[PDB]
Design an enzyme around this catalytic site. Structure first.
Site, PDB file in Angstrom:
ATOM      1  N   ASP A  19       0.821  -1.216   0.000  1.00 32.28           N
ATOM      2  CA  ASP A  19       0.000   0.000   0.000  1.00 32.28           C
ATOM      3  C   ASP A  19       0.859   1.272   0.000  1.00 32.28           C
ATOM      4  O   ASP A  19       1.952   1.274   0.556  1.00 32.28           O
ATOM      5  CB  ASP A  19      -0.884   0.018   1.249  1.00 32.28           C
ATOM      6  CG  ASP A  19      -0.065  -0.026   2.561  1.00 32.28           C
ATOM      7  OD1 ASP A  19       0.810  -0.911   2.687  1.00 32.28           O
ATOM      8  OD2 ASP A  19      -0.305   0.804   3.467  1.00 32.28           O
ATOM      9  N   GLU A  20       0.337   2.363  -0.583  1.00 33.82           N
ATOM     10  CA  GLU A  20       0.989   3.681  -0.514  1.00 33.82           C
ATOM     11  C   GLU A  20       2.511   3.683  -0.755  1.00 33.82           C
ATOM     12  O   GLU A  20       3.264   4.289   0.018  1.00 33.82           O
ATOM     13  CB  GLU A  20       0.700   4.326   0.847  1.00 33.82           C
ATOM     14  CG  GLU A  20      -0.788   4.484   1.137  1.00 33.82           C
ATOM     15  CD  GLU A  20      -1.062   5.152   2.463  1.00 33.82           C
ATOM     16  OE1 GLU A  20      -0.286   4.939   3.424  1.00 33.82           O
ATOM     17  OE2 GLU A  20      -2.090   5.878   2.554  1.00 33.82           O
ATOM     18  N   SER A  21       2.960   3.003  -1.799  1.00 30.66           N
ATOM     19  CA  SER A  21       4.366   3.068  -2.224  1.00 30.66           C
ATOM     20  C   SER A  21       4.589   4.303  -3.095  1.00 30.66           C
ATOM     21  O   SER A  21       5.047   4.200  -4.257  1.00 30.66           O
ATOM     22  CB  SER A  21       4.735   1.812  -3.017  1.00 30.66           C
ATOM     23  OG  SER A  21       4.474   0.668  -2.219  1.00 30.66           O
TER      24      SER A  21
END
Ligand SMILES: CC(=O)N[C@H]1CN2CC[C@H](O)[C@@H]2[C@@H](O)[C@@H]1O
Length: 504
Positions: free
Chosen positions: A323-325
């Site tokens: 998530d959220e890279s």
């Protein structure tokens, strides 16, 4: 016909009489009652001696619970000849249509009979049995003045979804092995069958990795807001897994990558392009961290972590986050996630990841998507690849404030009260998918104590638990709300520091 939605209850929250949650497939009541007395035994009988022995352990767990509140010393007998006043747990002649987790539970004046297909289904049925007895039964100390009765009744039951889970974030704030076990225990009583541990993030790394000892020595030493932090040794993790196993709960460990990795980056400078350790972070930002997607050291590190975790984690799944890279290019993310999926698979583990991890060209149809975004295009890749999907929409983000004025919680998915946590269906999040089931996520940016956990999980988790178990055609807020009111003394009895939600 006239219809309406629910407002707040005038004058404040509302928070012989069984309180079954989640609602079972069928429940009828007849005349008469069974009385649990000091001379009752639990009889167990399986199709062979090994199954009987597993049933025996399940019986002993049931007896311990019953003994705590009744003050009795109910013992467990291996026999298919229960005596009047007995509880009887059997897998002989289970109705196959009810599946591994399903059961019939019939109570007559002389006998309680739980009939399932597998030990797992007797464990789940025992959660219903505890709810048929009077409030007071779930007390951890002896209750006097309550006759221990169960109405003559007939229950058949089975889950709608196979995966009905809870995630605890132990990275943002650390919780003790005892605190984790208690949440697992509480969840099991509402037929939650999966526990996902978010073991690492920007602010903390919580699992001992022998080959990389500074993950603990440096990375476990903080948390959001600054504080002592904490970690689980590998033995402590095994202990959690074993405790969960006794409740037929699968534990899925998560090592989040390539983003949400500051704690690892603060432990080992060689994980960073400039060779220097990051400072540890105690804020709540916000997608800024990344492993080096094109350095072999990154993949050596991931492999060592996966190797050690796989050795101590019997679940066929490992959760690798994703998530959220936001500090990782789309091309590098695709590449990275495919490489670490290959490492996991080499250690005999299938990968679960948050969206957009299903888009990785290295994913297989055995990979699982945890769909948290729940937008029109989310899981297009997963669907096309035949990947199972676990849904975690806003309605399952239990860390959201109940209301604008909640003293704890976040609000980036809006507010999630007990009603919101109920009034949804997994098909609302994603259409055209193989939905494996649902997962309630409790992120811990703002939760520091056990009381904080209790407040947000209860009663919200009860709503999510019913969405996972009870078929949509049988779900109804007006019904559930009234059942939840009835259930309140039971939460109190368990010592749960729940929020008395004014919509109930
Ligand atoms: C999968 C997921 O919800 N990831 C992050 C999503 N962010 C959005 C802002 C929050 O910090 C929240 C954070 O708690 C979570 O770790």
């Amino acid at each position: 016909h006239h219809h309406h939605s629910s407002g707040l209850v005038p004058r404040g929250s509302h928070m012989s009489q069984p309180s079954i949650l989640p609602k079972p497939v069928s429940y009828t009541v007849g005349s008469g009652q069974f009385v649990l007395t000091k001379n009752a035994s639990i009889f167990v009988a399986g199709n062979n001696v090994g199954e009987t022995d597993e049933l025996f352990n399940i019986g002993q767990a049931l007896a311990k619970k019953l003994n705590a509140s009744t003050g009795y010393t109910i013992s467990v007998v291996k026999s298919n000849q229960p005596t009047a006043g007995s509880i009887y747990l059997t897998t002989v002649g289970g109705n196959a249509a009810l599946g591994n987790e399903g059961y019939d539970l019939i109570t007559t004046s002389n006998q309680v009979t739980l009939t399932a297909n597998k030990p797992e289904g007797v464990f789940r049925g025992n959660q219903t049995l505890l709810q048929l007895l009077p409030a007071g039964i779930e007390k951890n100390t002896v209750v006097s003045g309550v006759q221990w009765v169960i109405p003559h009744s007939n229950i058949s039951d089975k889950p709608e979804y196979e995966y009905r889970g809870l995630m605890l974030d132990v990275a943002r704030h650390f919780f003790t092995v005892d605190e984790v076990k208690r949440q697992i225990d509480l969840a099991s009583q509402y037929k939650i069958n999966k526990f996902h541990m978010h073991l690492s993030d920007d602010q903390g790394w919580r699992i001992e990795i022998k080959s990389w000892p500074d993950l603990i020595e440096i990375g476990s030493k903080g948390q959001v807001g600054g504080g002592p932090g904490g970690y689980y040794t590998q033995e402590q993790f095994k202990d959690i897994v074993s405790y969960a196993a006794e409740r037929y709960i699968e534990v899925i460990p998560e090592i989040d990558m390539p983003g949400h990795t500051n704690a690892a980056l603060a432990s080992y400078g060689e994980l960073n392009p400039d060779g220097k350790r990051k400072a540890m972070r105690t804020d709540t930002a916000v997608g800024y961290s990344t492993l080096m997607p094109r350095a072999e050291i990154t993949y050596q590190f991931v492999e060592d972590v996966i190797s050690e975790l796989a050795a101590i984690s019997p679940s066929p799944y490992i959760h690798l986050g994703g998530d959220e890279s936001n500090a990782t290019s789309a091309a590098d993310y695709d590449y990275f996630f495919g490489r670490v999926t290959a490492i996991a698979n080499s250690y005999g583990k299938k990968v679960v990841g948050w969206d957009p991890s299903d888009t990785s060209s290295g994913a297989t149809s055995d990979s699982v998507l945890q769909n948290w975004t729940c937008s029109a295009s989310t899981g297009t890749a997963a669907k096309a690849k035949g990947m199972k999907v676990i849904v975690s929409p806003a309605n399952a983000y239990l860390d959201m404030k109940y209301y604008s004025d909640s003293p704890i919680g976040l609000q980036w998915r809006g507010f999630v009260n007990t009603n919101r946590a109920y009034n949804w269906d997994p098909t609302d999040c994603i259409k055209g998918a193989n939905i494996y089931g649902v997962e309630s996520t409790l992120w811990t940016e703002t939760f520091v104590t056990q009381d904080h956990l209790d407040y947000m999980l209860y009663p919200k988790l009860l709503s999510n638990a019913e969405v996972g178990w009870t078929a949509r055609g049988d779900r109804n807020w007006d019904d559930f709300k009234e059942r939840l009111i009835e259930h309140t003394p039971r939460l109190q009895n368990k010592g749960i520091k729940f929020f008395a939600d004014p919509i109930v």
